[PDB]
Amino acid sequence: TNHKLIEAVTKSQLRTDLPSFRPGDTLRVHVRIIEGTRERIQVFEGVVIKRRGGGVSETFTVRKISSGVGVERTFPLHTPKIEKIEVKRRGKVRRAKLYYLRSLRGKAARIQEI
C-alpha cells in the first residue's frame, strides 16, 4: 500500500459514489459552479484520456471539442466539486494515456465503442 498513516488520515476524503470507468470512456461530469452565492451545475462531456495517481491524490482528464477548439479538464477524482459522473459510452482503446488524440481532429479522432 501507500504509507499506512497517509492512508488513515486521507481515508475519509475518498468518495464511494463514483462509477467505474477507463480511459476512452465518454463521461458527463456534472461540476458545481459556485460563482458568488448562486450554485449551478455545468456538464462537461468528453472522452477520458488520462487517469493517474492513487488515493485522495488520483486525478483524471476529459477532452472535448468546443467551437473547434480542444479543451481538457483535469479533476481530482475525489473532489467534492463534482456532483456526479455519468458514463455515457465505453470506448475501445489500446493504452492508458490517449495523448495521440490531442493531434487528431474530426473522424480521425473518433473512439470506437465497446
Binding site: 483535469t74 481530482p76 473532489t79
Partner: protein, 122 residues
C-alpha cells in the same frame, strides 16, 4: 505561458488574425502572461477590410492558453491554442463577436463583455 515574441490567434472579428506579443504588462521584469492578462502586441496578419490593421500596435487580453490554468479546487483547464482578444482601454473588445471557448478567469478579470459574447465559458 505567453512571453515576448509569442504569437497568438485573435478570437474575435476585430480584423486582426494573428498577433505577436511585444510586452507582458503588470510589472518590471514580468516574463510570462496567462489567461486574463493583458499584453501589448503587433498585428502580423489581418483580414482585408477589418478595423484593426496589419502592423497596428494594440492591447489584447489572453483568453485561451495551451498551458491552461489551475483552479483553487485542484482542477485544471487547458486549450489546444493560444488566443487573445483585442481590447479598448475600458477592457471592452474592439470587435463585436468572440469565437471559441473562453476560461472563466476572465470574469474575475472583469472582462464581462468578452465573457458575454463568448460562445462558451469554461
Amino acid at each position: 505561458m505567453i512571453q515576448q515574441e509569442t504569437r497568438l490567434k485573435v478570437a474575435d472579428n476585430s480584423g486582426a488574425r494573428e498577433v505577436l506579443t511585444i510586452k507582458v504588462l503588470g510589472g518590471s521584469g514580468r516574463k510570462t502572461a496567462n489567461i486574463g492578462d493583458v499584453i501589448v502586441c503587433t498585428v502580423k496578419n489581418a483580414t482585408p477590410g477589418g478595423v484593426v490593421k496589419k502592423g497596428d500596435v494594440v492591447k489584447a487580453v489572453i483568453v485561451r492558453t495551451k498551458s491552461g490554468v489551475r483552479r483553487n479546487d485542484g482542477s485544471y483547464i487547458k486549450f489546444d491554442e493560444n488566443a487573445c482578444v483585442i481590447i479598448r482601454d475600458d477592457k471592452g473588445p474592439r470587435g463585436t463577436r468572440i469565437f471559441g471557448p473562453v476560461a472563466r478567469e476572465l470574469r474575475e478579470g472583469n472582462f464581462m463583455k468578452i465573457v458575454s459574447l463568448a460562445p462558451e465559458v469554461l
